[PDB]
Symmetry: D2
């Protein structure tokens, strides 16, 4: 599991459950090619997006579908989605966790890059 996403909800104080997450890779022509997607679990986590063989160096975009998340809870949100854009570099550690903390008018994101 070289890429994991974990999402928390700062309003309810809970994992962000059943959030859609789409991952894209940047292609030669500067367009975003679908790469992986899924919905966060009851623990706010999304595992099994990719394999070591498929996850090569390059620029990736993780789009978190926050607007749908907030509307399903009856909450008025600001953002269309949260976007996390980063380069995967085989220099330094092998396992990427993208963590995000959601509020209706804010979000925070960090990277936990290990082993």
């Amino acid at each position: 599991c070289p890429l994991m996403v974990k999402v928390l909800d700062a309003v309810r104080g809970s994992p962000a459950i059943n959030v859609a997450v789409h991952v894209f890779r940047k292609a030669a022509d500067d367009t975003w090619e679908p790469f992986a997607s899924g919905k966060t679990s009851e623990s706010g986590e999304l595992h099994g997006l990719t394999t070591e063989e498929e996850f090569v160096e390059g620029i990736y975009k993780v789009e978190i579908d926050t607007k749908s998340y907030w509307k399903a809870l009856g909450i008025s949100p600001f953002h269309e989605h949260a976007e996390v854009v980063f380069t995967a570099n085989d220099s330094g550690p092998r396992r990427y966790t993208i963590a995000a903390l959601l509020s209706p008018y804010s979000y925070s994101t960090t990277a936990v890059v290990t082993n």
Copy 2:
């Protein structure tokens, strides 16, 4: 104005208005002495807590009364308050802005320290 506090509300997307703030300073006996207090304005800013003369070197605690803020909006939040504890002025007088971003179960704070 060497100590200021700015607070934003991450649910409404707005300044956090009427947030009470209490500042304490660690005394010679290692207790927290009340130093200054105030509330955020319509802009989410709190000016005039202290003076350059009174804001001497020490360890300060800025307590932002987040529970009282959320309860006044009819929300039951997680935290009692947000605490920001730091040593001030140890390399000479500085101007400190303590900024905070509030949600019911979460907050962020940062410090902006400038040399006038």
Copy 3:
């Protein structure tokens, strides 16, 4: 000034100075059209991106060039940029402040939306 951007540096405890910002607007063909750009001042603020007349209703992307900021300070950061994507002015004209707090492997953003 209906769209402003403020950026702080969580490592230095200081405004984030000379941060490039590019704003895009989604066009009729669903592509991102360049809308406006600028850089943060010595205060970490970017004023004068747009006008009330030009800042019409639409979906906007504010791209904060965090990688370029960190690399200019000699640091190799994680993210390419921070993106803030939102619908603006759908209930009439508003004033938007996009605030961001940067670290090498992390950022926070918030929006402050006011009705003049």
Copy 4:
């Protein structure tokens, strides 16, 4: 495990390893009584602080020793420590996670309260 603490480092993009964490309970006389303590693991987590029997309703303070953490990495920090103060309420969920994201001049904290 009714109380867990998990700490991340926003400068290195890693768990915050070997951070000292002290938990206090507020006593009748408004003083802070030591309750539990430990050091975060290689995953940035601190498990086994308390038991269901010991963790009663009341006001708790979690002090994270950030200043020592940053100085051991050779980084100049702002805060003396990070402090998270909250009421434990048997109304609503049973398991508390205090999560924190550390920078030299900032920190973020959230609560994940589940089951």
